[PDB]
């Protein structure tokens, strides 16, 4: 049966995620003309910019308040004030400036809402009166939740800041979740075929930036102030990822009565079907033949693989909880046996997830879902408790388990730095169902050749 249990150890060995501020920084890099300031020590931002570099091989703009010894003793609201001044004074185009707290500035208790109000009435009116500048508090203490909850918080804070319901319209708010450019592309394709306009939070396709002959391009997000304000006017909010867009979706529900459709994460055929059904329901638009065709093209790809190769494969999955769960679900439709799911933070709401209730009702073999997990929860099981696996699905930080215990691994989630180009491919939708199934197969195939495990069978499947 499928047993949900909390990690036993109190400590962390080999972490799956980083802290809430990293999630707020990720939200912020997805907004046009946005540069967050991370209020804390320099590493809290510089290390996170490296994370994003590791995934994308691009540099994104984020600043530090540069906390030092004095501010840690006496308070550091002045460090923020100077930061805002220095940032605005040197970056003329910036219009959005999140103020993102860290463990330090939360503990020492700096009044961020206070110092923002001061700058709005003060500095911004005096020195910068001709400029649009939105300062936004993001309270993201590192000693609760994770980058995942930080993301949820930040999306709420940006929508809370900007959303107004002046001119109701028929658009939806699509909160993609923390996904790849290839996911944004896929989701936009689905919306286009449904003929449904949306505010897409976030438009990060432009993270894949060119080298132009005139050296003029840069990676940036394209979610605009206008789009964020327009979130108040939508007829519904589709928050695909419950752990990354519940707060913003419910905020708009509670504040403007915009209905929130939370999940399921559209991973796999069946979950993509539910998305399209939910769009129809919300908007009244019919599901067109063209998507039934693309769906069937996807199913064809899956048919070639499922009972021949994927059936009964033993899978471990980790990463963002919505990804983990979505993948587990799709794997079961692919006849596979996900046997260990790691959910690598303290969220108390996993046990209440309907998708996890369904797994508990319906799974009929030995499965574990470990909450507050770390990578030692997987490695210890392999090394000392005889867990047998055919495949891992997760991000690159788990890689040494794959490498050193000879279990092949498909790179999914964030960050994926030990493979090239993965951000351009979908994991959601019908296109993503194709990509996941074919790449799991291709991963298994390479492994069968490595180990000489019936490698000769790959001829007339």
């Amino acid at each position: 049966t499928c047993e949900v249990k909390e990690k036993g150890r109190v400590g962390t060995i080999n972490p799956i995620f980083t802290c809430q501020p990293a999630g707020a920084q990720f939200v912020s890099i997805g907004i046009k003309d946005c540069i967050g300031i991370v209020h804390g020590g320099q590493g809290c931002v510089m290390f996170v910019r490296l994370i994003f570099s590791q995934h994308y091989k691009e540099s994104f703009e984020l600043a530090s308040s540069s906390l030092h010894e004095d501010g840690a003793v006496f308070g550091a609201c002045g460090r923020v004030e100077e930061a805002v001044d220095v940032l605005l004074s040197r970056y003329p185009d910036v219009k959005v400036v999140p103020i993102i707290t860290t463990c330090s500035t939360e503990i020492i208790g700096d009044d961020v809402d206070g110092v923002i109000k001061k700058l709005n009435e003060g500095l911004l009116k005096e020195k910068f009166p001709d400029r649009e500048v939105h300062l936004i508090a993001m309270h993201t203490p590192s000693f609760v939740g994770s980058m995942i909850s930080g993301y949820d918080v930040a999306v709420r804070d940006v929508v809370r800041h900007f959303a107004k319901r002046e001119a109701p319209n028929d658009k939806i708010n699509l909160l993609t979740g923390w996904v790849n450019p290839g996911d944004v592309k896929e989701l936009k394709h689905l919306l286009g075929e449904m003929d449904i306009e949306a505010n897409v939070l976030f438009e990060i396709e432009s993270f894949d930036s060119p080298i132009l002959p005139d050296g003029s391009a840069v990676s940036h997000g394209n979610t605009t102030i206008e789009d964020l304000i327009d979130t108040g006017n939508a007829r519904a909010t589709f928050a695909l990822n419950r752990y990354e867009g519940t707060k913003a979706a419910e905020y708009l529900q509670k504040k403007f009565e915009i209905p929130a459709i939370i999940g399921p994460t559209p991973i796999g055929i069946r979950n993509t079907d539910i998305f399209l059904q939910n769009l129809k329901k919300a908007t009244g638009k019919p599901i067109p033949q063209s998507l039934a065709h693309e769906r069937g093209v996807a199913i064809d790809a899956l048919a070639d693989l499922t009972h021949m190769f994927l059936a009964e494969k033993r899978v471990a999955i980790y990463g963002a909880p919505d990804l983990v769960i979505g993948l587990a679900e799709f794997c079961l439709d692919l006849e596979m046996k996900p046997v260990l799911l790691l959910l690598g933070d303290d969220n108390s709401k996993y046990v209440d997830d309907p998708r996890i209730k369904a797994l508990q009702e319906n799974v009929d073999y030995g499965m574990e879902i470990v909450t507050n997990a770390d990578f030692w929860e997987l490695e210890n099981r392999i090394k000392n408790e005889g867990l047998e696996l055919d495949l891992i699905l997760g991000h690159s930080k788990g890689r040494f388990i794959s490498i050193d215990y000879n279990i092949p691994m498909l790179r999914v989630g964030f960050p994926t730095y030990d493979r090239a180009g993965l951000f351009r491919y979908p994991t959601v939708g019908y296109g993503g169902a194709i990509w996941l199934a074919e790449q799991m197969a291709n991963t298994l195939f390479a492994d069968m050749e490595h180990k000489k495990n019936k490698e000769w069978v790959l001829n007339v499947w």
Binding site: R9, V10, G11, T12, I13, N14, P15, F17, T18, C19, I37, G40, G41, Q42, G43, C44, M46, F47, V48, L50, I51, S53, Q54, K57, S59, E61, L62, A63, S64, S65, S66, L67, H68, E69, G71, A72, R79, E82, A83, V84, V86, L87, S89, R90, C103, S104, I107, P141, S142, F143, V144, S209, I211, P213, D214, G215, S396, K397, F400, D404
Partner: protein, 513 residues
């Protein structure tokens, strides 16, 4: 004279932190400021004091549980971003630990949490009996006494030893404060606590080497061929108990002065051990370094032999690249020591023109070394920020920069190639072979046909034909070489394999008695 960036006029203090080496100017005439606080909002390249302590110096130790007392973030953000390898199966890259400080610890403290963590860690890794606890922002602020907890555990558990590093992010302007803190904490807590078996008449500490892509293994190979016992390395490929015996060295060979001069300075004071500064990079600096180390022990013959065979083996290949690299402009933009290790020898030996150097966290001593070795005209920058970096690229138009990963990707967008000065490309870059590897990577970056393609505007109505589906590096590089060069019988491209270090781990070293 001092230099002021257009981008930094609105922050006039920045003028004090950069100088162009003027005609006839000596070190007494101008020197950048250094080791001052950071300007908030500037998008400085700098990191935190926990970075300098834990991430740079502490973690290289290969037989140690590196546990960060704090929330998960600090630990995750320092994991799998470094290439300090080891001959203990890269234990220090594969396993990392955080205590996972939570809300309820903010009021009450997290000393119980810490101790439980320590026991869990030793239990999970029964082959590891050494630990270093690193303080972070959060645990500094809540005031846990890490030192007391570590002593409580060592009393309970005599088979283990625990080093304590109290260097949180905010403790200082940059990496630099953490270098100091861990240097001093190590010598205060740990040096003198172990008596080492000596296995030779010639004994060194190799100090300030972090073994990026095998640099330490390159150097220690030379030393083992000289019949020198390397008592310890601080800290690349280093053993915890090896470092506890640093007091017994006959000499401190110091490569990275920035990070490790502190501990050498105190070893001279406390135990009378002399300090010899060396260079790890380049044929001359390295030969001089090896000559001096051998001559100090009366075994200069052995060092001369090594120098002779290595230069013969590799100089024909270095010179291949030099000939194609002549006059190419380079910015030396690491964090610290590398900038001055490289500044002269790279001009002399690879033919590059150094047009700029920069230090993220360096002191005025590093700018001294930097400016001393650079040519007139060179822009030196202290605590550079992103806009200044970009303006320097526009102003100097370098052919390549040696810099960090993400700064490399900034340069990428404006058509300037990079090598990773920090983590290397096809490293390691120390040693004779390493210097050729280095030169080759520079060649391959500069003369990339993809780089040449990126400069072409395909929309341009004027653009000429191509009528050819490729252009090789050597097509783009060899067009204007002397017939003598181009047709040489000695000059050749790098002949070494992908991994230049694995062979050394097998190598056998004859005792000289």
């Amino acid at each position: 004279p001092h230099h002021e960036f257009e981008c930094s006029k609105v922050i006039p203090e920045r003028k004090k932190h950069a100088v162009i080496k003027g005609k006839g100017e000596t070190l007494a005439d101008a020197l950048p400021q250094g080791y001052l606080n950071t300007i908030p909002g500037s998008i400085s390249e700098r990191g935190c004091a926990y970075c300098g302590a834990k991430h740079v110096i502490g973690t290289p130790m290969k037989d140690v549980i590196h546990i960060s007392h704090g929330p998960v973030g600090c630990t995750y953000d320092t994991w799998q971003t470094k290439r300090y390898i080891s001959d203990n199966d890269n234990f220090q890259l594969k396993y990392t630990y955080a205590t996972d400080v939570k809300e309820k610890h903010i009021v009450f403290g997290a000393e119980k949490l810490l101790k439980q963590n320590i026991i869990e860690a030793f239990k999970a890794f029964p082959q590891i009996k050494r630990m270093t606890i690193y303080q972070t922002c959060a645990t500094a602020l809540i005031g846990d006494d890490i030192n007391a907890i570590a002593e409580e555990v060592m009393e309970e558990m005599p088979e283990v030893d625990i080093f304590v590093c109290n260097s949180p992010g905010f403790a200082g302007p940059s990496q630099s404060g953490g270098h100091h803190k861990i240097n001093i904490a190590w010598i205060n807590q740990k040096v003198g606590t172990v008596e080492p078996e000596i296995t030779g008449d010639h004994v060194i500490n190799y100090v300030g080497e972090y073994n990026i892509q095998g640099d330490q293994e390159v150097m220690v190979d030379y030393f083992k061929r000289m019949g020198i016992q390397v008592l310890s390395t601080f800290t690349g490929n280093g053993s915890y108990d090896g470092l506890r015996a640093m007091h017994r060295a006959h000499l401190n060979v110091l490569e990275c002065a920035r990070s490790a001069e502190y501990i050498c300075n105190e070893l001279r004071v406390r135990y009378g051990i002399p300090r010899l500064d060396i260079d790890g990079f380049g044929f001359k600096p390295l030969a001089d370094s090896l000559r001096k180390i051998g001559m100090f022990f009366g075994i200069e013959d052995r060092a001369k032999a090594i120098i002779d065979e290595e230069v013969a083996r590799w100089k024909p290949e270095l010179d291949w690249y030099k000939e194609r690299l002549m006059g190419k402009k380079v910015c030396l933009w690491p964090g610290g020591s590398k900038l001055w290790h490289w500044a002269h020898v790279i001009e002399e030996e690879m033919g590059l023109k150094v047009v700029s150097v920069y230090t993220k966290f360096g002191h005025q001593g590093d700018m001294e070394k930097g400016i001393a070795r650079c040519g007139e005209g060179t822009l030196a920058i202290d605590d550079p920020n992103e806009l200044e970096g970009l303006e320097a690229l526009e102003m100097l138009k370098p052919d390549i920069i040696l810099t960090g990963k993400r700064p490399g990707e900034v340069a990428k967008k404006v058509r300037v190639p990079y090598l990773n000065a920090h983590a290397y490309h096809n490293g390691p870059y120390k040693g004779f072979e390493g210097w050729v590897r280095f030169a080759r990577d520079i060649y391959n970056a500069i003369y990339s046909p993809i780089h040449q393609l990126s400069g072409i505007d395909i929309t341009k109505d004027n653009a000429p034909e191509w009528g050819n589906g490729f252009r090789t590096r050597q097509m783009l590089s060899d067009g204007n070489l002397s017939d003598a060069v181009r047709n040489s019988e000695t000059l050749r491209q790098y002949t070494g394999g992908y991994d230049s270090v694995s062979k050394l781990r097998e190598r056998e070293y004859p005792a000289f008695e």
